[PDB]
Design a protein around this ligand. Structure first.
Ligand code: CL
Length: 228
């Protein structure tokens, strides 16, 4: 295989996610577990709000709460930065602009801790309207399909990405969330720097019928594309 880190994703990998958030002073934490299967580009997570009631809609946290589980086609294997940075991992940082509303800033470390892939995140949100679509909880509990556009950032030995999420509004149009992303390796080992391509995402949100805590079950299907 074209990276040593790629070897770590040939089977099902257990996942842990931990997020600490503060949006307009409303603090919260989220803990999740699940598994990823990069051979099929699939991951499943159950995420719990461990502080009680989540003060923002679950859909607004989907992108923050594992691009190393993308399925890269065989002809694209030299473009998989994410797996090449494993097991030491990478930092993923974003600014997320909600149109006509506030923004999230996130910093995450995605790395192996033993045999488990862990995503540990800090999120800060500011400038939200208390009666906007986010703090007013006006978003549908569902998720559209999007492309994440990736380019190399050789100066940082990493990558950049951008994309636009469309969150359906209950009885309305959509709330846009414009994402800007950077990833840089944590380790010093060599990584794969890609040609321009994209990750095609499809996501499904659901609930565990036996779970009484505030939670989200998230299934993502992720496939790299955009190179002939
Ligand atoms: Cl929600």
């Amino acid at each position: 295989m074209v990276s040593k880190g790629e070897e770590l994703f040939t089977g099902v990998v257990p996942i842990l996610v931990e997020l600490d958030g503060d949006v307009n002073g409303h603090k919260f934490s989220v803990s999740g577990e699940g598994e990823g299967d990069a051979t099929y580009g699939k991951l499943t997570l159950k995420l719990i709000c461990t502080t009680g009631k989540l003060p923002v809609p679950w859909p607004t946290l989907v992108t923050t709460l594992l691009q190393c589980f993308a399925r890269y086609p065989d002809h694209m294997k030299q473009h998989d930065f994410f797996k090449s940075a494993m097991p030491e991992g990478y930092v993923q940082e974003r600014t997320i602009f909600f149109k006509d509303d506030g923004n999230y800033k996130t910093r995450a470390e995605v790395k192996f801790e033993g045999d488990t892939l862990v995503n540990r995140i800090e999120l800060k949100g500011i400038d939200f309207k208390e009666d906007g679509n986010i703090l007013g909880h006006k978003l549908e509990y569902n998720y559209n399909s999007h492309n994440v556009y990736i380019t190399a950032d050789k100066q940082k030995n990493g990558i950049k990405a951008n994309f636009k999420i469309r969150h359906n509004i209950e009885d309305g149009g959509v709330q846009l969330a414009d994402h800007y992303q950077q990833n840089t390796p944590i380790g010093d080992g060599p990584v794969l720097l890609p040609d321009n391509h994209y990750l095609s995402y499809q996501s499904k949100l659901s609930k565990d019928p036996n779970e009484k805590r505030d939670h989200m079950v998230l299934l993502e299907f992720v496939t790299a594309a955009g190179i002939t």
